[PDB]
């Protein structure tokens, strides 16, 4: 990792992150065979089997009722991202719901537990059968429940049953609680055997396959499930796994803290509002403004392209000489000098103005330094902690190359506009000069 | 559904949603009889019953310690909505907590598992007994645990016990984790049988009853539960189900994307900030600014009136010639032209400006059209997908009548104010002329 302190604006840009960006969805359609359960009835009295059976049949009968429905940039982007995801998933479920497609899916899963299927709407879904409960119900439990008597002396039957239905009951809980669209792929929607098997079937390059098989917790975390329905005594649902059609491109993260100067004792503060993740995608700079969008694993940042807003390629001029590019770098400005620490990956920005006493120290030595007034950049090599008054921040002990891009801060070199002095999320030349 | 594309402001209004709005709360006071448990002790050694018994008794002894304590409109509304809900529930629990009330509630539940009761503070709560664990502990386990030495050879007893207490332990987990006020009604607080029974007891019109019995997943999701306490060996808690005292009134949702236009190659943009759900309530237009407030099923949008902000009946003039209405229609405006897709219910708004390549395509045909730059409205019949550079958005395949309300966009027809050019959430006539 690399990190430039941009002295001109009290903001770091951290570079050398690689990219993984979701660009499509892969559909795995699971036929969980609940089995013959609605032909078994305990009728003798209270019993272990009756209780598990009633739960299983009650859950199944419940599930039949469950169904799905068949500028401040952050709020915009994360609005679109979720709307796009559900619409992409629902559009496929709405093909699979057709009885011609379910019966095709079910039929190709007759003698194999895994099938590749092409829907009439052309999507080449994978299909999977889960039968562990059906096999138990058909071979064991149907033979045990003689003539509706079921308080049998075999407790191994009843304890066994409470294991096999456990997955089914968990699937019902998750779809019913979420009204048919789960936010993430639980171990009960897709076990880790099936995720690895589904990943290995994706129509993707082996680089993505290896990367996905390593980061499979992220693949699980980005995907989501939709309930198709209950058909016969199979619940049918589907899991939209991500396809990471962009990888290995540059990304960087911009952090900022308030830059201020006491012009005649009045703090002309400025803060960059264009903070957050940026990536190059296919020859376009893409900005991911919402904090849910992107997550790191080492150098890899896992973003969603549906959350990205394209920004002009000139926008990196805001990281080189924001003072003097004509691109409209977004800032806030105003009178009040907030003093704060912004923890970057390889260090901390420390905004420290009149009032608070800021210091940096190491566990070996205590206070190493009292920081000057004004924004300072503390590499994670300079100290182990920063303090702001009595508040102590532990710094991220991480190897990387820090840099300083020197320059007199804008706040200290341009004059603030007399009125309005406080302006939120404006192009910089509206605050200064 | 209907969807008028308002050309002059790059915003759709989608219409013909009907309304369901929570306007009160209905209380069910559950009495979960934990049973005689603290008169039973297992003292011989490790055993199955002892472990379940110890969990049950430890959970009960834990639960006795758990107790409850008793403009950018979005952040306001969702502040008020939560505060109102909790205060309305707490105010009822503070009646039920009186021993003179608990003992009345408990007494009417002596002969029946369901009782209707009027608290001394006048609220006509329903009361319910949950009693299966008491019956087990009294009839089975007390007889089996005998003179201590509960390590009996009967394992049906131990496995049975781990089933009956499971609800109780889940109620303890949920109230303890949430410090006495759960955010939603789990199956453990209120089973489907109890919810359907409670709905059928509500003092409401039959239309609401049928609607609530169909949408009982929503009733469960809008309600919440409060722990009253532990009285003797009964845990007593209450579930606040919603009352939907306004239904079937008109609602609409306004969506917008940046309406930019270029003057001497400088962009000028506005964005409508009055986005989100609106409804007519009792002859008042009411605005629901926070995205948690409202949820759709079919045509019905389930909002909460505590979240609604009343807006003047003239405010619908922001949907028809906002260019000349005297109402202060809230917009943002500024230089930077975001290019984005806003997915409406019956289509997509596609803001597409200098830079990104925008196209629309069908799964059967590929690219149908390269979109013109400028805001475009794409009905879900014109195409199956919209792309913004490499990004692809699948459109909602939903039938409804799209409309276009034509007009030259405001930003194409008024000059921006020279300074401040960037203004956030302002009355439109501060941006232009």
């Amino acid at each position: 990792l690399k990190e430039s302190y941009l002295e001109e604006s009290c903001s770091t840009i951290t570079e050398g992150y690689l990219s993984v960006l979701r660009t499509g969805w892969y559909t795995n359609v699971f036929t969980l065979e609940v089995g013959d359960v609605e032909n078994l009835t305990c009728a003798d009295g209270p019993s272990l089997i009756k209780t598990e059976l009633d739960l299983t049949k009650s859950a199944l009968r419940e599930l039949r009722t469950v169904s799905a429905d068949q500028f401040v940039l952050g709020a915009i982007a994360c609005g679109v991202a979720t709307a796009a995801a559900v619409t992409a998933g629902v559009a496929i479920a709405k093909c699979i719901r057709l009885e011609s497609e379910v019966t095709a899916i079910k039929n190709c899963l007759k003698k194999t537990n895994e099938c590749v299927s092409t829907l009439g709407c052309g999507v080449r879904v994978l299909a999977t059968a889960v039968r562990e409960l059906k096999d138990f119900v058909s071979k064991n439990l149907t033979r045990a429940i003689n003539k509706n008597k079921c308080d049998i002396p075999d407790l191994k039957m009843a304890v066994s049953f409470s294991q096999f239905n456990r997955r089914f009951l968990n699937v019902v809980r998750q779809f019913s609680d979420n009204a048919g669209i789960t936010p993430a792929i639980s171990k009960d929607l897709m076990t880790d055997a099936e995720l690895a098997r589904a990943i290995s079937n994706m129509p993707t390059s082996a680089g993505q396959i290896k990367l996905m098989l390593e980061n499979r917790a992220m693949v699980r975390r980005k995907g989501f499930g939709i309930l198709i329905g209950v058909y016969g005594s199979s619940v049918i649902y589907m899991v939209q796994l991500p396809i990471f059609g962009v990888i290995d491109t540059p990304c960087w993260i911009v952090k900022a803290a308030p830059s201020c100067s006491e012009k005649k004792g009045n703090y002309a503060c400025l803060l960059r509002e264009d903070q957050g993740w940026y990536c190059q995608n296919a020859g376009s700079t893409v900005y991911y403004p919402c904090e849910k969008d992107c997550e790191t694993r080492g150098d890899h940042v896992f973003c969603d392209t549906a959350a990205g807003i394209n920004v002009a390629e000139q926008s990196k001029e805001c990281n080189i000489n924001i003072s003097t590019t004509n691109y409209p770098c977004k800032v806030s400005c105003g009178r009040h000098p907030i003093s704060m620490v912004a923890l970057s990956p390889l260090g901390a920005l420390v905004a420290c103005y009149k009032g608070v006493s800021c210091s940096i120290g190491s566990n070996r030595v205590g206070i190493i330094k009292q920081l000057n007034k004004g924004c300072s950049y503390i590499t994670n090599q300079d100290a182990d902690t920063v303090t702001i008054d009595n508040t102590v921040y532990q710094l991220s002990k991480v190897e990387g190359e820090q840099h300083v891009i020197k320059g007199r801060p804008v706040s200290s070199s341009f004059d603030p506009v007399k009125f309005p002095q406080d302006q939120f999320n404006v192009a910089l030349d509206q605050c200064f000069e | 559904l209907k969807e008028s594309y308002l050309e002059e402001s790059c915003s759709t209004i989608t219409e013909g949603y009907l309304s369901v709005l929570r306007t009160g709360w209905y209380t069910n006071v559950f009495t979960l009889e934990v049973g005689d448990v603290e008169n039973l002790t297992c003292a011989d050694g490790p055993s199955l019953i002892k472990t379940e018994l110890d969990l049950t008794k430890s959970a009960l002894r834990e639960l006795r310690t758990v107790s409850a304590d008793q403009f950018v409109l979005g952040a306001i509304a969702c502040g008020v909505a939560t505060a109102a809900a909790v205060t309305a529930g707490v105010a009822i629990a503070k009646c039920i907590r009186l021993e003179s009330e608990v003992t009345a509630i408990k007494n009417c539940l002596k002969k029946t598992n369901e009782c209707v009761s009027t608290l001394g503070c006048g609220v006509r709560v329903l009361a319910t007994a949950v009693r299966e664990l008491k019956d087990f502990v009294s009839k089975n386990l007390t007889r089996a645990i005998n003179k201590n030495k509960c390590d009996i050879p009967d394992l049906k007893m131990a496995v049975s016990f781990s089933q009956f207490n499971r609800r109780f332990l889940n109620v303890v987990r949920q109230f303890s984790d949430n410090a006495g006020i759960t955010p939603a009604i789990s199956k453990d607080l209120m089973t489907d049988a109890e919810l359907a029974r409670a709905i059928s007891n509500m003092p409401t019109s039959a239309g609401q009853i049928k609607l609530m019995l169909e949408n009982r997943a929503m009733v469960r999701r809008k309600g919440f539960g409060i722990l009253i306490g532990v009285y003797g060996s009964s845990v007593i808690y209450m579930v606040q189900l919603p009352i939907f005292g306004v239904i079937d009134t008109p609602c609409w949702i306004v969506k917008a994307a940046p309406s930019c236009s270029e003057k001497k190659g400088n962009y000028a943009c506005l964005l409508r900030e009055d986005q989100g759900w609106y409804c007519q309530n009792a002859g008042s237009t009411v605005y629901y600014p926070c995205e948690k407030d409202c949820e759709t099923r079919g045509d019905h949008v389930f909002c909460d009136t505590a979240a609604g902000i009343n807006v003047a009946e003239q405010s619908k003039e922001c949907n028809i010639n906002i260019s000349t209405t005297n109402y202060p229609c809230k917009v943002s405006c500024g230089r930077h032209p975001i290019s984005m897709v806003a997915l409406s219910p019956l289509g997509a708004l596609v803001a597409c400006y200098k830079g990104v390549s925008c196209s629309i395509g069908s799964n059967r045909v590929g690219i149908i059209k390269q979109l013109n730059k400028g805001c475009s409205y794409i009905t879900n019949q014109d195409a199956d997908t919209v792309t913004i550079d490499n990004t692809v958005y699948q459109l909602s395949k939903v039938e409804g009548e799209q409309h276009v309300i034509k007009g030259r966009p405001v930003s194409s027809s008024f000059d921006p104010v020279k300074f401040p050019q960037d203004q956030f959430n302002v009355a439109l006539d501060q941006c232009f002329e």
Epitope: L21, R22, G24, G207, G245, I247, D248, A282, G283, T305 | -
Partner: antibody, heavy 124, light 107 residues
Amino acid sequence: EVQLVESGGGLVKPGGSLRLSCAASGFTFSSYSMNWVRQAPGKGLEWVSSISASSSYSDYADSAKGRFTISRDNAKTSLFLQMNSLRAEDTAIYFCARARATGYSSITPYFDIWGQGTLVTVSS
Amino acid sequence: VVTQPPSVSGAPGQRVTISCTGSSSNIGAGYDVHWYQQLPGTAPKLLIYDNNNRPSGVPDRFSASKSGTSASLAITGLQAEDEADYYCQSYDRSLSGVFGTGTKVTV
């Protein structure tokens, strides 16, 4: 203009080595996967090798494995193919191609911009 | 291997259709199909990507589809400028990028 320009192609005796170079210009070269493709004279296109947008992944055809080595300098905006043990059957025009993909359905890349290619002759 | 007919021909204004028959490791594995035109003495030109999307600056009379393990390019309104090789392309789960044997059109 967005242009790729191959260079370094020439005549090599079998068993010799060669290093093709493809200078890229007019585009954000560090954003794109880059590829080498070849065409034996009058034969079809053969994909040779590929490199990811910042060199973390490299792929080779079975004819190219071990014999070739693709690399890129994102600062020089230059794509290279080192070649060794050149057989007579390696006589071909080599094109570099910018490669691009949409992840929506599947990740299969396609070669949107091609260089005009450089003739490599492998003979006595 | 991805296979195409060695040549096709027609009079001007005919439709000609070029098949690209792949297998369960490539086109049948879900990978999409792309088509390239190569006029004599030039680098290939992308005609089609992702089965049927057409670049800017490709005549609307080129049209294509994918179905099963196969694809086809229909050159409607065949014209003197189409006197070129046409290569399909896909990706193979084992071989990675596979071009077809390439079909010459003759007007």
